[PDB]
Amino acid sequence: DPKIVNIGAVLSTKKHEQIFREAVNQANKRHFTRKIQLQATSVTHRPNAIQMALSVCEDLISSQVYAILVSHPPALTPTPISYTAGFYRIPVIGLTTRMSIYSDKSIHLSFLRTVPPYSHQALVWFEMMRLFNWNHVILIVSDDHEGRAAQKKLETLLEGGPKADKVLQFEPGTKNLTALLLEAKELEARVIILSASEDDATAVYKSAAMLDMTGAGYVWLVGEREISGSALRYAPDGIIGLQLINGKNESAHISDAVAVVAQAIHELFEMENITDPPRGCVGNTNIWKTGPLFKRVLMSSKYPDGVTGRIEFNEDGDRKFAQYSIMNLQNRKLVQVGIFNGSYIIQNDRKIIWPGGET
Amino acid sequence: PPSIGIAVILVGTSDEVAIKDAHFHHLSVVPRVELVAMNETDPKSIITRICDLMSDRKIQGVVFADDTDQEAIAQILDFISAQTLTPILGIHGGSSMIMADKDESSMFFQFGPSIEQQASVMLNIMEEYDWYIFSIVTTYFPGYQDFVNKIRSTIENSFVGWELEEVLLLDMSLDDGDSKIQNQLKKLQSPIILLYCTKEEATYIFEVANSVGLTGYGYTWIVPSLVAGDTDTVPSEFPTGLISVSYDEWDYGLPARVRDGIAIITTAASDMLSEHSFIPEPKSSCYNTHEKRIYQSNMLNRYLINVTFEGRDLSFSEDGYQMHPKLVIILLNKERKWERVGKWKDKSLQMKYYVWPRM
Ligand SMILES: *[C@@H]1O[C@H](CO)[C@@H](O[C@@H]2O[C@H](CO)[C@@H](O[C@@H]3O[C@H](CO[C@H]4O[C@H](CO)[C@@H](O)[C@H](O)[C@@H]4O)[C@@H](O)[C@H](O[C@H]4O[C@H](CO)[C@@H](O)[C@H](O)[C@@H]4O)[C@@H]3O)[C@H](O)[C@H]2NC(C)=O)[C@H](O)[C@H]1NC(C)=O
Ligand SMILES: CCCCN(CCc1ccc(Cl)c(Cl)c1)C[C@H](O)COc1ccc(NS(C)(=O)=O)cc1
Ligand SMILES: *[C@@H]1O[C@H](CO)[C@@H](O)[C@H](O)[C@H]1NC(C)=O
Ligand SMILES: *[C@@H]1O[C@H](CO)[C@@H](O)[C@H](O)[C@H]1NC(C)=O
Ligand SMILES: *[C@@H]1O[C@H](CO)[C@@H](O)[C@H](O)[C@H]1NC(C)=O
Ligand SMILES: [Cl-]
Ligand SMILES: [Cl-]
Ligand SMILES: [Cl-]
Ligand SMILES: [Cl-]
Ligand SMILES: [Cl-]
Ligand SMILES: [Cl-]
Ligand code: NA
Questions:
Q1: Is the domain defined by B113-246+326-359 classed in CATH 1.10.10.10?
Q2: How far is the CA of B161 from the centre of ligand 12 (A)?
Q3: How far is the centre of ligand 3, averaged over its atoms, from the C-alpha of A323 (Å)?
Q4: Residue with the nearest Cα to atom 3 of ligand 2?
Q5: Which of A103, A163, B174, B191 has its CA 20 to 30 A from that of B185?
Q6: Which residue spans of chain B are classified as CATH 3.40.50.2300?
Q7: What is the 3-state secondary structure (H, E, C) of chain B?
């Protein structure tokens, strides 16, 4: 009876493929599916980018997928899949990729994600600046795409209140940073915000401790990369950072993505003159004419009751209403001292300890 | 002298005998060229064809030409070049249509002008005819920022009384069912309009602009090479009076281009082997680039960009475009034919008309 509509996925393991199947299978039970009925098509990540592009063509687009779920490879990026699917204007839904570069519409012209880019951590910092009445901050960021992205996002929030007394950029890979950090020390503001990779945050932390800038008086406010791996290992006690709740749970995001995509398909097919996507890549060089419409329907999708909370997307197709743990390094243990619940800061009953010993 | 393999890939093109005849080499190395004919220009056809070549023979380099308007072909080739670390020259067609922000590891070089060079020619044209008030329309097609930036920075450092009235940014990754592109174009007042987008994007945008009365007399639209594209294919939406900068097979024929492509790659490899007593080993496979990447590099780039052949400077920029190409200014006249109306040469403009004839 029903028209079969294939959804595609590139996922980390075969376990995650089966979770994708069952998620689609449950969408079919939930929904009214006399007219259209979803079907799951999936592979796991190929060992390199060229194989991965070929697989998207051979295994997914040959099944005429309306959309493709992509997880970030756990140990190679979503990029080849964004490229090849973007060639046809088939939407790609990123499940766990956080890099801000996937927000650039020129490079990734049909890419949504159910997690926020790292640069959106600026939204949480800003609420924390209101709450804790830090009205003068210094912003140190890596002079790469990610660091600059964080800067722009925080500045948009500040410019249009709390103010940024100064912004300092440094060359990614630089080990001694005392020149940069001596410029920050001479300023009157004592709240420092950092965007940087694991390794670059390590370098910062070491230089700052050498300059006695990690002690009482100072506040350090930081994201998730900057309290991971080796950064965590040299981080100064009392530092505040963030962790995206369910941010690495591929299984949760498969569930939510499939719910959102199923909703959007059934909504798409309420409209007139929906065309099928191209069957296979070979000999096909035109875009899927309905692809840009389907993108719009996804962009404006709302799914309140998501496993990762309230799903909506912003004008770049990035997750809104994402939830963060607010973490505080006490006695060298990361402790949760509250959450950002998507719109609101909620302090829990565990006390924050600031750099030095402050209370 | 030892032979290096060079693939010449021709899509849709039969000057095959004229081409083998235009192609002599006195250097440390001699080319073994292999003409290959392709029919399809989707991602799978292009990737597998080039990867088959690399696996069946020993390819030091690829010279690529097509007869399409498909700018994606350049994107695909940059990706293939970056991943396999193999020199690819896109000398004609979609393959030559500007690819802005090539990969860091790209060895992909294009015949034709940079974006910035075209922007600069467009302002010279406007100066010639004292058109000083203008607006800009772009899509999100990559390059759009370089375009706007180059304009803005040229005119803001100029005693000339430029007036940039409006800059529109059109999002054609979404459907246009709410007539948003109409609404945005309605805002345009300027008598000169610079348009940066793809040929297919331009034909929709012109269709809409016509409907709101912006294509007739007292509006003059100016566009870059990739919008005119193949000047024997003229969408009916293109308005008479359209001016374009062009590097589409005018005075620089495909036969000559293939010859120069072969020379650039052959010379580069000769120069390297002279200075270093090796050249890079032709990749045996693109299906294991992940293993063999610590053994590869884009060393050959620094030679690829500094070649002169038969007493001619064929330099590329590091950014992967021809250094000083002779550009042809063209006009879409009352007969819907593209007509030569200028040359840009030795960095001087020479126009045919002192006053524009009727459209
Ligand atoms: C993150 O956390 C925030 C803040 O806690 C949540 O936002 C709140 O959501 C709750 C619902 O769970 C809302 O509570 C309702 O408030 C209504 C009035 O709101 C006005 O007044 C408040 C307080 O000044 C303002 O914050 C708000 O902007 C409005 O001006 C009440 O009318 C509701 O009462 C209803 O339910 C009760 C309980 O059953 C009944 O007794 C009543 O009869 C009535 O039916 C209710 O109390 C609250 O308004 C929200 N606040 C804000 C600031 O948005 C987010 O939901 C949460 N995010 C996630 C994803 O969990
Ligand atoms: C650094 C920039 C890389 C660009 N990347 C390459 C696309 C690509 C690369 C490789 C392959 Cl295999 C394929 Cl199939 C496709 C994406 C591609 O260029 C996107 O192309 C468009 C981007 C934007 C637009 N304009 S728009 C957003 O509709 O209004 C039109 C086309
Ligand atoms: C991941 O999410 C799923 C729900 O989809 C849940 O069952 C599981 O406990 C989560 N895993 C972690 C580590 O929280
Ligand atoms: C391309 O088309 C030509 C002309 O028909 C044909 O001879 C050739 O076999 C085709 N190539 C492929 C790969 O099919
Ligand atoms: C490029 O042109 C010639 C060598 O071909 C020489 O004058 C110049 O130094 C070259 N530049 C290099 C090698 O970077
Ligand atoms: Cl295929
Ligand atoms: Cl707390
Ligand atoms: Cl073919
Ligand atoms: Cl690439
Ligand atoms: Cl171009
Ligand atoms: Cl086009
Ligand atoms: Na996006």
A1: no
A2: 39
A3: 15
A4: A107
A5: A103
A6: 1-112+247-325, 113-246+326-359
A7: CCEEEEEEEEECCCCHHHHHHHCCCCCCCEEEEEEEEECCCCHHHHHHHHHHHHHHCCEEEEEEEECCCCCHHHHHHHHHHHHHCCCEEEEEHHHHCCCCCCCCCCCEEECCCCHHHHHHHHHHHHHHCCCCEEEEEECCCCCHHHHHHHHHHHHCCCCCCCEEEEEEECCCCCCCCCCHHHHHHCCCCCCEEEEECCHHHHHHHHHHHHHCCCCCCCCEEEECHHHHCCCCCCCCCCCCCCEEEECCCCCCCHHHHHHHHHHHHHHHHHHHHHHHCCCCCCCCCCCCCCCCCCCCCCCCHHHHCCCECCCCECCECCCCEECCCCEEEEEECCCCCEEEEEEEECCEEEECCCCCCCC
Ligand at shortest distance from the CA of A259: 3
Chain B residue numbers with beta carbons less than 8 Å from the beta carbon of A60 are none
Hey, what domains does chain A have and what are their CATH numbers? Answer: 1-116+251-322 (3.40.50.2300), 117-250+323-359 (3.40.50.2300)
Does B72 lie at the interface with A, CB-CB under 8 angstroms?
Answer: yes
A51 contacts on B by Cβ (under 8 Å):
287
Domain B1-112+247-325: CATH architecture, name and number where available: 3-Layer(aba) Sandwich (3.40)
Q: How was this structure determined?
A: X-ray
A84 in contact with chain B, both atoms CB, cutoff 8 A: yes
A:B CB pairs within 8 Å: 84
- Please identify, by atom number, the ligand 2 atom nearest to the C-alpha of residue B101: 1
Q: Å resolution of this model?
A: 2.3
